[PDB]
Design a protein around this ligand. Sequence first.
Ligand SMILES: CCCN(CCO)CCCCCO
Ligand SMILES: CCCN(CCO)CCCCCO
Lengths: 137, 135
Amino acid sequence: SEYQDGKEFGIGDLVWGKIKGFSWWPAMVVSWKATSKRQAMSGMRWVQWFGDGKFSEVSADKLVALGLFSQHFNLATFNKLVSYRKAMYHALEKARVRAGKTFPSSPGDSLEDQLKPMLEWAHGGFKPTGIEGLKPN
Amino acid sequence: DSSEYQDGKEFGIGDLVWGKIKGFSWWPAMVVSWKATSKRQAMSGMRWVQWFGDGKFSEVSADKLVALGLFSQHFNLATFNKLVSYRKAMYHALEKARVRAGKTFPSSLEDQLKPMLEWAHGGFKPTGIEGLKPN
Ligand SMILES: CCCN(CCO)CCCCCO
Ligand SMILES: CCCN(CCO)CCCCCO
């Protein structure tokens, strides 16, 4: 029922979302019931931002699939803000689990170290699954 | 309405669970509110848990949690024999279970642990897993 408005994106979808004064940031579409807030208005979606876990209401027409990765990733913000690197880690970890992807680990690799192969995977088109692997189920 | 962890998946605040992190055996924990953690709200489909034995907090997928009551299935005998840290975790977890279930034993950590472990492995009789519920 919720979000059945003929527009894009449903509960669980991984997305980039854009707030004024902010880069595109990774998020997951959620039900209004998870937010402790209120039902969304027409054509809007509740999203939860990776990294800080906060909830925002955003137009379905203003979200893009996380799978358009290199297009929306912002290297300048990544190098400038630890909060963006953490967001990218949590977003890509969710993507990895969904795709059944694995990466060679080694304690105690830092944040940047863990991110390196995840970012290469994302920039490379999420092989072998492709973006189909990012879908919820 | 709308509230913490109302995402349609299993597990609520206070639930005793086993949690699985890559690189670790299934480990006992309690589901906690994000407010207990000094961190941030958990992503939809995930829960904050506090691990027995070390008191640390982790954000864990509900798909990587199971009820502590499924004890024999998730208890790792190899890990128990190998790691003092896991035996310590078993003690604190099963002591919480014992108090919730209103269970008493005849009364050392290892000596204390023995009948608690027998009880858990045997299915938490007489209450069964219903006895482990919070409140
Ligand atoms: C849409 C932009 C993402 N926000 C989420 C908060 O609602 C986080 C920004 C933190 C930047 C400070 O380091
Ligand atoms: C998955 C279990 C979580 N704790 C660590 C908390 O982050 C494990 C304790 C290590 C035992 C080393 O002897």
